Assembly symmetry: D2
């Protein structure tokens, strides 16, 4: 008994920041507040303000987002003046998630304007926040508008792109777990959500590329991450884009003091789960190699022992689900993979 | 650009508590947590648990709700185990609103089982909580189920019934303000929401009654309060049930340390607004008199001065709206009413 | 897996016809066609046209509705110019149902402006048409707008009001059959649909009245009939307003050459079913007596034998349902009622 | 003020016919009727029946669809027994559209099982029928389920594949016209609809292929055509997949006694419109050449003069729209293209 809110505004391409005003006019907002990640205003602020003001939209306030702490977010949410019609979030994944959550708490339209794509948070119904010092995924609301400027994304640090590659590829293992879950009568698949998620991913995986900062490559990456969010909205849950691989990453977040980027953790987890599933192994290996994902991850010195533990505790994150990692045998296989596999032996310490 | 979630389960009548298990089976919940207001478990707890367990539904936890403090609610919300499918709230208005808010934060189905009807919180998309020590109305989510046992309601303290009468009669003034707002191009009316809110209220207002603990009376009261909540869900905002009269009450809440029951404040506010509107004055006067609402309110010693200030600050609660009290002249009229009116001179 | 379209426009009261322009402006229609029942334009046409034109809405065409024949309706439907945004139907039940069906076939918004209330056709998702010479209830679409002028209704012939009373009171038995059906696992009740249908009916039944042309009485009658239609739209089927009593009437329609008004047949059927249900008998008897419904019906000379046959064949109209009349014993009881009951002995031949 | 019904069931791939029973079980249908196009039962009937019966679903009737005449369809619609829960249509485009329309008239769930893909009728909310001897597109309802078996499609006659290519490629010009329309304030674009239609098409256009009976090629063709229909359902109108190119085809249908396949007419129209738009010309030329669409069309001897007339009359099909062909200048340009263009000089007489 669930309701679907497909975003009204979807713009991925060139020259978007400059035209943000005309882009969001479709929402009929009279009065907005802009929330910028640190340093972001210095880069794009004036242009964004000019653009919005010239589209005859008033700006109540311009603020900076400094953290993803649940308490500070709730405080700030209720500080938002009652005459505000809409929230605009401009920045990285953390900034987006914070503003998204405020809009959720105040039941306000939210426009997502990410300056990087480290994951699909910028398009989805879930927010990643700090809850009692621990990074945690919590229900929020899907953005009403998503505006991604590929020029801006071109300029982002490569860590965020690798992170995005990791969160995208996870759709392959997530869908497999979802099907396994259904076969075990522990859920029901949403066919359309599967179809779009699958199409987004397969489009990306097939795209030729010279480098990861390639415009065509980035446009495909962003389109798919956007799609993933909408697929979640359509399904009414995270399954289209979140399976065991995600549960592994969430488990890591609960005991590591300094977890790596969500996308990075999810990517490694996806590789692992592919070998456990014995499904789409070559595709996943190829994309994560060819893009330099594995290369990059080696430099981070993630521990085998931390993954082994996350694998064991993955099921605790969503105990009513039934992924491969809700089965003890599959956990042991997963752990044996982490100890044996050649790529892992290389990129993990 | 808004989505409507009409509750799946609606049950108002006799022998509901005992059958709560079969009633909620429709939701297909596998594992629930029960939250009881203080003293409520001692009264209905065992029965409720038995009923639920016999319908093959697992109970993860049974807890007590001790406040409506936003911080504690958030803390408790994120303590709810991940395997929980649904939240059931059993108790008074404060208890219900707390559990409802947790369900909102965790995106979980919520079953509302009120043991009193002091207001339409038990059926609506808004929660009344403490925010920085101040009672404040905040967005939440409409319950997925509402189960009201009229026997339990029969046994509630009269103060909650009077409160309920007050929150119900407010529909009359709210709808008028809403129409005024539309005429001033500051919103658009949702015709269906107007229809059902109007029907619930008119049904109640016409009902003959010996006393306020009359079963037919109570059943009507509860039906309308339930309707009000669904009306709000349908409209996508509070306007079907919340106009200037409510803005008055919310304004009182911001400066009074010890506000009265929402319903009580809203009732008095409704009487005042009727005279300002010069609309349905006799109906409102009659119902609030005949039920003993006014008598009851006299005993509370609410101050004329507090109402006058609330009237002046009502507009600040929702400055983008356009109720009668968003116009200075109508505020002066409202304040002259509080100083003059005979009933008010008596009960304030 | 079903979608709900609550009407955008709902207006029941005084001075509605004159203000039809301003009332429908909310729909943002640019170009409409008006369909009038026979004689209806003579009464209200100029006013309606003036009002619409003065609200800056173009009128493509003004036409007359002459029948409820399915073939003529389809032909006329596809003659509607492609530039037409909306259809307005002004007249009696047959006229409304015809225009409603055209709007259904062309997927056009429909505004219902009934000049009588012989039944809830003016507010519901079903149309009553002639199919192979037989009156038949068929799926259509709920109006987007309903505009009922109580002054116009005041002036309608009494037969239509009695018909309306009959179609309204049927909620009581329909809801009982629906509950019975659920208990037998042959359907699932929609709680909200039950609540509103129940509230509309109970409001009406309790209303004091001097005569059936009383303004307060008519306003209540119209509100309820309107509610009944919306109840059906909400449930996604007819059950909130259509039970065995309806099946009886539909069965009569299949073998009678000259059936009486839907409402009239339904009313008598409702009385019968109340006795079969042994539920709300006194209320139903009281309302149908007090309003003069029974006295009116006596003049029509409906046959006991026709009702007995309709009772036997009721189940054939909807064989997958499970009302009381899907059980042989209850049919026998129904027939014994028609042969015995004092009121029926007086008002039927 | 419009409601979206995304299909519950979407299956495109191998071994689908045989498993139709398990596939449709998700719909919880208790009793269905199967409607087969001519000759189709002989090919797949027994298997389909077995499969359905073994999934514990009753089959009320098995019938043959013999045409797309509106009158015969209405007659047959109302002959469907009241206890039927769902209609299953198995066959070509005409067959599918006929059964779809019956489901529309009886407000019944519909499962689309196409044995060819000559167009996106099998996934969309519109039906192509004969109205007064003229092929005409009319509002229906989107299927509740779509089941396409690529093995079956492999074995279809090439003319349907070429037809499908033609109806698919039209998305490129349709979207351009839609944007033009919006710029002229004559409609509002649905961003998500644009995104999926665009993604389906671009996926197909990029797919390498040996032949048009290539399994990967076909799977992509079918996925996109499926997507086009859902895009239409999402938008609440046909614009995502129907622009001037379609208006041209529909205009041909109104004066030709023997029109060619919708898809074929649409494909040629799409080439023409691309040159008028001066947009995506090379892509469209490449795909229609490389697939052998143009060579195939040459054999049909469509007349230049017919296209010129269709171009002039295109606007009459939907006069309230504002496509390029709602502007006189663009019409002469289109007509000069038909007289001049090298490809057209070759493939048209
Ligand atoms: Zn993720
Ligand atoms: Zn209230
Ligand atoms: Zn009826
Ligand atoms: Zn087409």
């Amino acid at each position: 008994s669930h309701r679907i809110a497909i975003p009204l505004i979807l713009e991925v391409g060139n020259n978007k920041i400059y035209n943000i005003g005309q882009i969001i006019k479709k929402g009929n907002f009279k009065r907005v507040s802009l929330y910028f990640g640190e340093g972001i205003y210095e880069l794009f602020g004036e242009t964004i303000e000019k653009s919005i003001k010239s589209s005859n939209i008033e700006i109540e306030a311009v603020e900076t987002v400094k953290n993803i702490d649940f308490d500070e977010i709730g405080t700030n949410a209720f500080k938002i003046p009652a005459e505000v019609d809409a929230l605009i979030g401009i920045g990285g994944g953390k900034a987006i998630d914070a503003v998204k959550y405020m809009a959720f708490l105040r039941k306000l339209p939210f426009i997502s304007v990410p300056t990087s794509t480290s994951n699909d948070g910028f398009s989805s119904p879930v927010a990643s926040l700090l809850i009692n010092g621990k990074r945690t995924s919590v229900p929020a609301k899907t953005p009403d508008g998503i505006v991604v400027d590929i020029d801006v994304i071109k300029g982002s640090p490569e860590k965020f792109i690798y992170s995005g590659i990791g969160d995208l590829v996870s759709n392959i293992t997530a869908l497999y777990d979802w099907k396994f879950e259904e076969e075990n009568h522990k859920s029901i698949i949403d066919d359309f959500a599967v179809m779009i998620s699958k199409k987004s991913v397969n489009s990306f995986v097939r795209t030729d590329f010279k480098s990861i900062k390639d415009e065509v490559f980035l446009k495909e990456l962003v389109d798919s991450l956007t799609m993933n969010g909408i697929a979640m909205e359509i399904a009414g849950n995270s399954s289209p884009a979140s399976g065991a691989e995600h549960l592994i990453s969430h488990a890591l977040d609960k005991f590591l003091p300094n977890p790596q980027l969500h996308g990075i953790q999810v990517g490694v987890a996806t590789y692992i789960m592919s070998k456990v599933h014995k499904h789409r192994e070559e595709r996943i290996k190829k994309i994560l190699s060819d893009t330099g994902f594995f290369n990059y991850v080696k430099g981070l010195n993630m521990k085998k022992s931390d993954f082994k533990r996350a694998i064991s505790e993955a099921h605790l994150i969503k105990p009513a689900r039934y992924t491969y990692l809700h089965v003890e045998k599959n956990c042991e296989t997963a752990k044996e993979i982490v100890d044996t596999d050649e790529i892992l032996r290389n990129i993990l310490v």
